[model samples]
Target: SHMCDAFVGTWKLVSSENFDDYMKEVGVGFATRKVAGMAKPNMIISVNGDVITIKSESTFKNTEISFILGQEFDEVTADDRKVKSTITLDGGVLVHVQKWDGKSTTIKRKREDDKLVVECVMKGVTSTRVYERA
Candidate 1:
């Protein structure tokens, strides 16, 4: 509910840091990584009752997911992994975790001012992306 209230809006990316390294750690290859690095994605978050949906759009591809709070669901990630994903919200912060093939990645999104700060972590590499209202 907090996530739906705070993050239910279109967000355009403003900056990214170390996303390439984080992708490599997550099993993305050179060619795909190069293209992914060039694409800027917009996040569109919406809600329907207890179900929350987050959509990502870019030139390379588009991805979207819907789930209720605390439920684990099948997720097809941007890089094409079939992951078990769960998302939870607390105090205007949303934490999302995805698991596939015994590996897991964590992403935390915090709302600050009018911007959303996305902190991503995988295999000891961390990346940050800043997004603002679209």
Candidate 2:
């Protein structure tokens, strides 16, 4: 099996923790965070050859990013922050890092027991999101 096969599917968000504080730490506006908080997002992930695409969609807004392994690119986030982003695979976990405005964030995504767990970190603040197969 391919190294990315485990992540190739639609994942529905099941739970979230401290996402608001995480957004605040990342410079998201209060109004934007309120709306973004109300939306339940599903992540659609796919792979075509060496390119992997992950799309997070909700009624509020959507963000789609495609990157090759260890490649850096520009990303316009859901909260409208433009950042330099990169993704790499390590031991089956996808480590995504984004940098902008003197701040950096690390988002680690891993698949376990048919579920997806995402951990987001920025400036000592951390958030956790869990997703189930959809």
Candidate 3:
């Protein structure tokens, strides 16, 4: 079952849809977005009890965010944009809610076949990204 050590380890980004565009909407510059688009993000997740720590690692930067499951907490992106977020799990789907400025967002993740699918939505931007276990 997913609750029994199903999501525990590092996942590498394998595909995305308009990831560059999504980054641009998030205020990333053209040059940065270009580089980020080609970057293979390494997501390291560790869950213990109600707490979850996520590490998005790349050659350019390594970002780490930690939160308690189902509990809201302050979240600041690597670029320092302020956000309030919470993490939860529905069945086997991992969910995260992020609120920044006057907007809110939700990111859902689940395993499909041999891939891990992630759906992210924020205001007018919505995208899906996939990762493969290595």
Candidate 4:
């Protein structure tokens, strides 16, 4: 698929805005959230047929996640922020389900131009963050 083709490359974060609110919903400390919100992240995506492997690296934290294009898998956030999730593609849109952990949370993403735009919404919280091509 073109979406898969487009996503199989390294991406660097030019800027991130409004992530503090999302972190607040997750019970992260204000200072920590502020620091994390200011970080620029980089991502490397590799695709092999239907499988995709993503390495998301930031100055503050780094982790790797892999899954099949249409399959569900467990997702644990950075810094041991416990949330179970499954990501799948709906058409060209990426849909993510972050199961409720007393509070509701979800993150959705899609590729546009040379960037990936993500909308993260949680109970009492809503924010958007963007990542650009490296």
Task: Give the lDDT ranking, best first.
Answer: 2, 1, 3, 4
User: What is the C-alpha lDDT profile of model 4 across 1-134, one tens digit per residue?
Assistant: 45577667788877655678678777788777866777788878888767778888888789998887556677777746666667788878777776646665777777988788878887767787778877
Q: With candidate 2 superimposed using the best TM-score fit, by how many Å does residue 89's alpha carbon deviate from the native?
A: 0.6
Q: Looking at candidate 1, what is the lDDT of residue 41?
A: 91
Please give the TM-score that candidate 4 achieves against the real structure: 0.84
lDDT (Cα, tens digit) per residue for candidate 1, span 17-122:
9999999999998999999988889999999889998899999889889989889999888788999999888666789999999999999999889999999999
The per-model lDDT (C-alpha) reads 0.90, 0.92, 0.78, 0.75
Best by TM-score: 2
lDDT tens per residue, model 3, 9-53? 888998899676667666768777777677788888887776678
Tell me how many clashing residue pairs each candidate has. 0, 0, 0, 0
Question: What's the candidate order when arranged by decreasing TM-score?
Answer: 2, 1, 3, 4
Clashing pairs in 1: none
Q: Please list the residue runs of candidate 3 whose C-alpha ends up more than 4 Å from where it truly belongs after superposition.
A: 1-4
Best by lDDT: 2
TM-score of every candidate relative to the true structure: 0.95, 0.96, 0.85, 0.84
Off by over 4 Å in 4: 1-3, 100-102
Which of candidates 2 and 3 reaches a greater lDDT?
Answer: 2
Candidate 3 C-alpha RMSD relative to the actual structure: 2.1
